[PDB]
Amino acid sequence: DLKCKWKECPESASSLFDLQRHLLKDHVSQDFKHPMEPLACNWEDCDFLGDDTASIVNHINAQH
Ligand SMILES: [Zn+2]
Ligand SMILES: [Zn+2]
DSSP, rough: OOOOTTTOOOOOOHHHHHHHHHHHSOOOOOOOOOSSSOEEESSSSSSEEEHHHHHHHHHHHHHH
16 A cells, blocks of 8 residues: 655655556656756655666655
8 A cells, every 4th residue: 555745746656666667658758869867866855866767666666
């Protein structure tokens, strides 16, 4: 049972995996066309930053 902690998000998850896939796919489509532009957490209070979307999903599940 994963709960999206996004302020602008009114949707919840059924499993820890659900938010990861929901946040990764829904909150970050990812253009995959960036030469050198690392990804950063998109939380209001969080200042987490990662090299790739996968690095975030790992952080989101642990920190979010
Ligand atoms: Zn969400
Ligand atoms: Zn974060």
